[PDB]
Amino acid sequence: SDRVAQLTVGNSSITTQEAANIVLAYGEWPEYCPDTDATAVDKPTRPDVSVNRFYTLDSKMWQENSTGWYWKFPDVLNKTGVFGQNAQFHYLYRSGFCLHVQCNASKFHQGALLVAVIPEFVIAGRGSNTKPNEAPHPGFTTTFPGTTGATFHDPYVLDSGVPLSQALIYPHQWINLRTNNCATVIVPYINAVPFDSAINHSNFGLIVIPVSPLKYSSGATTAIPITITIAPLNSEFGGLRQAVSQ
């Protein structure tokens, strides 16, 4: 009565057989901007169907020597569909997200993953140079990976100087291959401003890191992918102008 679930948003539906309870981030549901907290004057648009649905990204094979992956959510589905088209024409943006990460295997595989959101997940440069001219900084595809994603180099320090062990304070969930095969996190709009550009600022980022390695005996299946879907709950847009690319 609890390990089954069907999440339906718009014209999409996600069915599962082995699931834990859904994680609601900070106890707050995604809601529309109230008139007291608002600061713009132009009326915002609310498509409510074409931008509120489960967009499925690509799958990534989880090998034995894998380190992990991360995304930037107001940047991943920024070029795909009506949400991206509506976000390229407008200047202001505000929405929540529903998350779902699929990873199934047999009852003979072992391993565990950690999927969590990190608000304001700034990527750190890797180097030992303090001069301003040679201090290493991450590239644009490292900061904003896009719909593909980026890999970790030192996932022990979250590629940010912050230890992974303390990253359980964020809204997180485990994917233990002996217990479940999916993880679901609902996250509201977390920002210090009511509206913000969905192109020059990623609010938070999803991270999948295998802490327990994938292990199996010789003879079983060897292709274990990680699939992720994203639902932009309660989308709002404002400041209509020409469409920009980036």
């Binding site: 309870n21 859904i22 994680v23 981030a25």
Partner: protein, 43 residues
């Protein structure tokens, strides 16, 4: 007592009265189904 300010501004005062509102379930149990204390978390 408690060093009230002598100014027209309100940010130039000292620390006001304390507030013991913890509400720690927003970080420890951020789930939708209220897990009972004496039960299995998964059925």
């Amino acid at each position: 007592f408690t060093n009230i300010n002598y100014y027209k501004d309100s940010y130039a005062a000292s620390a006001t009265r304390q507030d013991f509102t913890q509400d720690p379930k927003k970080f420890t149990q951020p789930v939708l189904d209220s897990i009972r204390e004496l039960s299995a978390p998964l059925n």
